[PDB]
C-alpha cells in the first residue's frame, strides 16, 4: 500500500550494516598497542565477503 | 482500492551473517614480563 | 632464534616461509640423522619447516 511501501522501504534503504575486512578488525584497535612490540598480534580466521 | 498503484517491486539484499562482540578473532600472545619496554625502547623495569 | 622466541616473532619468518625465499637460522639446535637414501630424493627435508 502507498503508506506501507513507504515504511518497509526506508527500512531497506537504511540497513545499518557496513561490510567487514580483516583490516577493519585490525583497525578497531588503538593506533598504539599495535606499535608496542611487547604485544603480539596475528590473524587466523578468514573472512567471507 | 486500485491494484497497480499498490503493487511495488522489492530491492532486498541476500544472505548476510551478522557478527557481534568482534575482537575474538584476535589471536594474541605476550612476551615474557621480564622483557618490557616503554615508548622509551631501552626497557621498562631494567634493574636486574 | 634467541632474539625470536623473545621478540614474539614478527611474522617476518612467517612471511618468508610462506613465500618461499632463500634464508637461514641460528642458535641451539636438535639434529636428526636419516639413512635410506630415498628420504632425500623425496626431498623430505622441505617438510618440517
Contact B30, A39 (CB under 8 A): yes
The cell numbers describing B37, all together, are 619496554
Chains touching chain B, criterion 3+ CB pairs below 8 Å: A, C
Q: CA A23 to CA A42: how far, in whole Å? A: 12
Residues with Cβ within 8 Å of residue B12, at least 6 apart in sequence: A12
**Residue B36, SS3?**
strand
* Radius of gyration in angstroms for the set of CA atoms belonging to chain B, rounded to a whole number: 29
C11 inside 8 A of chain A by CB: yes
Contact B43, B31 (CB under 8 A): no
State whether C7 and B30 contact (CB < 8 Å): no
Picking from A30, A22, A31, A29, the residue whose alpha carbon sits closest to that of residue A49 is A22
Question: How many Cβ atoms from other residues are within 10 Å of residue A38's Cβ?
Answer: 15
Amino acid at each position: 500500500h502507498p503508506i506501507d511501501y513507504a515504511f518497509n522501504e526506508y527500512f531497506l534503504q537504511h540497513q545499518l550494516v557496513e561490510p567487514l575486512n580483516n583490516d577493519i578488525i585490525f583497525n578497531y584497535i588503538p593506533e598504539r598497542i599495535r606499535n608496542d612490540v611487547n604485544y603480539i598480534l596475528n590473524m587466523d580466521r578468514n573472512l567471507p565477503s | 482500492f486500485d491494484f497497480r498503484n499498490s503493487m511495488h517491486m522489492l530491492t532486498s539484499n541476500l544472505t548476510f551473517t551478522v557478527y557481534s562482540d568482534l575482537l575474538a578473532f584476535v589471536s594474541a600472545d605476550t612476551v615474557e614480563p621480564i622483557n618490557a619496554v616503554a615508548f622509551d625502547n631501552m626497557r621498562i623495569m631494567n634493574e636486574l | 632464534l634467541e632474539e625470536l622466541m623473545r621478540t614474539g616473532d614478527y611474522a617476518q619468518i612467517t612471511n618468508m616461509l610462506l613465500n618461499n625465499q632463500p634464508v637461514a637460522l641460528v642458535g641451539a639446535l636438535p639434529f636428526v640423522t636419516d639413512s635410506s637414501v630415498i628420504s632425500l630424493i623425496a626431498k623430505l627435508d622441505a617438510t618440517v619447516f
